[PDB]
Amino acid sequence: METILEQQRRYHEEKERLMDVMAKEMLTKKSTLRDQINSDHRTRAMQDRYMEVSGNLRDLYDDKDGLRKEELNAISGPNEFAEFYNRLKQIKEFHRKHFEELLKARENPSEEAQNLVEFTDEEGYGRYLDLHYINLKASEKLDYITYLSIFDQLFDIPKERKNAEYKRYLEMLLEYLQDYTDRVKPLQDQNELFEKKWENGTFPGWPKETSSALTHAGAHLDLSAFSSWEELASLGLDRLKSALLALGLKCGGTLEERAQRLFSTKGKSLESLDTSLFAKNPKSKGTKRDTERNKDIAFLEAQIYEYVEILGEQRHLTHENVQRKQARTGEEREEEEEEQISESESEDEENIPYWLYKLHG
Amino acid sequence: VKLTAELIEQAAQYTNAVRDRELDLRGYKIPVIENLGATLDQFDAIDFSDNEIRKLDGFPLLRRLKTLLVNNNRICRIGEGLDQALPCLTELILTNNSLVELGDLDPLASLKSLTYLSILRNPVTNKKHYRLYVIYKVPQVRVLDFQKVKLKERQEAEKMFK
């Protein structure tokens, strides 16, 4: 039947093709990798990163490449994302897959349908091509991801990862505090909290409205994070955070004070003299109850924390934006909005009568 | 002529004669089944007749797909996770394809709603005990090759292969 050798071959070949594609990409615009790698640096500290000079001059060896705009960088990053998905799949199936009389036996059947007049130049060309849209040069996107659209992932106010839109959450927040004493900027001042978010909470951490809000917000920040950095392994990050959550807490709440001792995150909101009473409190009916009811919230809070930390640059960038727009005039604010809009909707790569029939009769 | 998103978007779309939403993918010389995501799970039937597909595999999760007409292709193997991407597959027409060994039909045992199966004009058909083998290994089938699976055949297939 089907000779596995051929299948495994085609697999290794396709993998090669993909590696070559995303490598060509990383070649034309090194930023693609650089950008990614930099972020990775602050998540997995071990990661080795290139010489700063290379990053700045946007070069990989000798040639300094033209700087690209954000929308394109992100685009290609999501494209490379799907490519890496394909690759991972093929690698998988491959792992799960890996005489003379028969030679003449098959060579005989190869004589079948001799009259097959047709030119066949479409195996490596259709693949090479499948991973490299327009007639000649209009759309950077490969045939592989021809229906890939960033605007369906990023809103206009996010500007492909430049900012994160928190106005909406300012609204919900007003709805949560049941007043209006809170301004967009004071709300951002609140977000900055995220020990502070634990010991100086905006609201009581056992309040319903508050916990719900925090959930929604957390989810948003996380999706935004992975959305803006396709190239980094999402599962890796997730698991890292989860293990930090489980392992850091258990011995001492990871939060320790020389005066009050050991604090409990989310469920109890109490300190403890020594580690001893802390441990014998983690089996008590109280802590069982709380850790059994407020688990999801505590975990979500934590995620909001670490993801906001990983996005400090974006948080600052946006807060800045806010203050700017705020200090604009009418015309200024309008023109700025025009700009954000244009950036949003721009190509990622630039080149009878009755009165007459009655009268006539 | 890759089965592409663009290909699916210009393809004749209509309500067929048995009142189901069907997509027409006939005669395009498609070799590999792929990119079905773009149909958006909006079809009850998909007609892949007269193409060059080798393996019935590569489907996304399609909850509404109930009928697959795959006449005159080159199907020689059936993918293993078919129920996970096609849970309500009820009718599978494979007439005039290339399935040669009884064991190659084994993956159809996992299609829990499969009730109408047609494998005529496949070499596998002439294998000894082909009908009883299908009946015992794919008991959910009620009509096989346009003939009613009867009780006596079920019992007979229970002896052999018990």
Add this chain to the structure above:
Amino acid sequence: SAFDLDVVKLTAQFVARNGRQFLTQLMQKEQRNYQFDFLRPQHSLFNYFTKLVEQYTKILIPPKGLFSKLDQVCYRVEWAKFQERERKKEEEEKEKERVAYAQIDWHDFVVVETVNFPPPTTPE
């Protein structure tokens, strides 16, 4: 070309395990001129053959071993781009030279008298 492809890849499949053991026997058994040409380095396609076999030979390498795996390939790309740019610049300078050489008075003479560099065109 499906026929040619298929026979190349098949004889390549067998040639990969049996080497010339099954093919070198087939050539003498069947008697094919076409088979002889395929075996031979004269026929152009032969080269691509040497590829396929190698590839199959490769699949035999890690049989029983799984692969449990970008930045580098990107940096290589970058390099290539850089080199390309150097080539471009050079072409430009050359162009300038051609222009000026073509554009100076070779009749403004003022002579005085009348009558290894490769290792020298470096630095040390």
Add this chain to the structure above:
Amino acid sequence: KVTKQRDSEMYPEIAEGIMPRHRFMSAYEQRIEPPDRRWQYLLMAAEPYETIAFKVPSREIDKAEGKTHWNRETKQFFLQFHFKMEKPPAPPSL
């Protein structure tokens, strides 16, 4: 072998073009037009400075044989046997 020295530092124009350029000219054409001719000159030129010539009575000297990489620059003569120490401003020709 000739060693031509240039000024001691005493807009991307004239520096972009590589060094100085040499060409072999026949004396059959001269401005004074006195009448005399019949020998070649190894003229050397640079934008600001004045041209220079060297008489070559011998029909052929050092005319080598495949000393094949194709960057014509100006001609086989220039790439084949010239060096331009641009850092010190010394043009060697042999």
Add this chain to the structure above:
Amino acid sequence: GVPIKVLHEAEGHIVTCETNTGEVYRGKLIEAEDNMNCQMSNITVTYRDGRVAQLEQVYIRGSKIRFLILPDMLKNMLKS
């Protein structure tokens, strides 16, 4: 009404309709009247038990419609 204008805009597009009784009709919107009366074609209907059927031609009274899902092609009436 502003929503009504947006509905008429969806004529010729594939839309989904749920009735007051929870039957779900998906297909091409041919005509939408001012009172929300809806003519559609080549329908898939999904009953409350989950079963599907296929219909060529339907017309549903506006009052007995609970809601409609329209394409996202329309989303881009932002003045109001």
Add this chain to the structure above:
Amino acid sequence: KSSKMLQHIDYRMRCILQDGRIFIGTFKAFDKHMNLILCDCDEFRKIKPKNSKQAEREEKRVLGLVLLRGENLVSMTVEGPPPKD
């Protein structure tokens, strides 16, 4: 003023239906009858979460662009601020 609806326009809104469903979407338009236009709209059945430690979301369905008839609307509250886009 007439503003009581116009205020909440562009905001994310939690709308309650007569059968008891919860429609959450971006409130973009209304009219005399309170027929509503809801962008990026999802439907919930079991709960409106206030941080339910077990889970917040069961029987959630993505709908998309929704026009709801006012006959079947009961009430609305502010769910979250406008998305910037």
